[PDB]
């Protein structure tokens with residue numbers, strides 16, 4: 001069963017801007033996604049201090065970057081807190097509305113797309129390089145879900161039947177045809193070194 | 209009743225480094241504290257989406273900066289999630305241990321004190337400008353506490369009998385005698401504009 005949802009108009013507008021604006025410094029998408037993973041790992045680490053059983057779904061706290069040239073995907077995997085169905089459908093869009101509005105206002109005032117992270121919507125920078133984004137996620141209090149959007153104003157959520165994850169999130173970037181450089185080992189290494197070198201979790205770049 | 213606690217050796221070492229190192233760009237302390245307030249406000253905002261009664265202790269989400277020349281204090285006030293007694297005594301130091309270690313290693317490798325925020329211990333940058341820091345805090349699930357430390361390897365916690373806060377945190381910086389510029393309106397304005405201009409909560413700088 002796949003459910004289809006409309007983005008609120010503001011988030012749809014943001015996705016369109018991200019897709020439509022001429023902006024060459026696209027590499028910043030990876031810093032934003034890795035930062036998101038780091039925050040999610042901080043969150044589960046913090047919560048387990050008071051309830052250690054929150055780690056029964058997996059003790060290791062890490063980030064994997066997985067390129068696949070055949071699928072043309074770059075997958076950012078974390079074993080963080082994960083997202084509930086309510087996050088995917090309601091909570092996250094509610095928070096995003098005001099960040100979007102502030103980001104938009106900053107842009108007209110001369111701010112730069114690379115500042116998107118300050119407005120809490122850095123995830124959407126994924127659309128600088130991806131035609132479609134699939135998010136597979138599992139939170140302790142909930143089932144494993146697959147969220148997906150190619151923009152165009154809608155997203156889907158379904159219960160995921162793929163490989164069970166234990167706990168955490170995979171962001172699967174289905175790259176635009178002209179953005180395959182982000183599958184290349186030395187390009188990904190370069191970006192992580194430049195933007196993410198102090199992340200406090202091991203980041204493993206898988207080799208193809 | 210005042211309880212006195214020893215910092216773990218690593219955090220004590222970090223505080224000493226922050227106090228002892230020659231480093232002129234001290235203004236970064238305010239960005240770190242405002243960023244901390246912002247995160248705490250994000251946290252309560254997020255939690256109230258699923259439990260709106262979490263805001264019964266106060267709906268407004270904001271940050272006040274309050275200079276007092278007579279007391280020689282700069283107070284950063286937020287109406288964020290606040291901190292529990294377990295945070296003050298156990299949880300926060302546990303998380304801080306590994307951030308401290310990474311920060312230390314980054315420094316020897318040539319990183320800069322201004323990067324302290326990437327290691328999740330930016331609060332301690334308060335000691336660049338303050339001889340004593342007092343933290344008054346109230347979390348929904350707990351009583352109002354006062355934490356205090358002048359470094360030297362220990363901190364105290366007591367139940368606070370001052371003005372009840374509703375919910376949130378006040379960081380009261382008892383400034384070093386040579387650091388009173390941070391009580392001056394135009395200096396604080398300058399710093400906020402430079403480092404904190406996109407914080408998604410109203411920041412009110414009180415006038416003396």
Ligand SMILES: Cc1n[nH]c(-c2ccco2)c1CCCCN(C)c1ncnc2nc[nH]c12
Nearest residue numbers: 036037040080082092096120121123147169
């Ligand atoms: C599916 C979705 N819907 N709306 C958003 C969103 C809203 C604002 C920014 O992103 C998203 C994406 C949310 C991404 C950031 N996040 C909240 C995350 N939470 C938990 N573990 C994560 N590991 C990577 N990121 C994670």
Ligand SMILES: Cc1n[nH]c(-c2ccco2)c1CCCCN(C)c1ncnc2nc[nH]c12
Nearest residue numbers: 244245248288290300304328329331355377
């Ligand atoms: C009292 C104490 N003990 N150990 C630490 C600490 C550990 C690592 C960084 O700071 C602190 C300070 C913690 C400061 C950051 N924080 C966790 C905060 N939590 C909730 N509302 C806040 N409003 C400002 N900040 C807030």
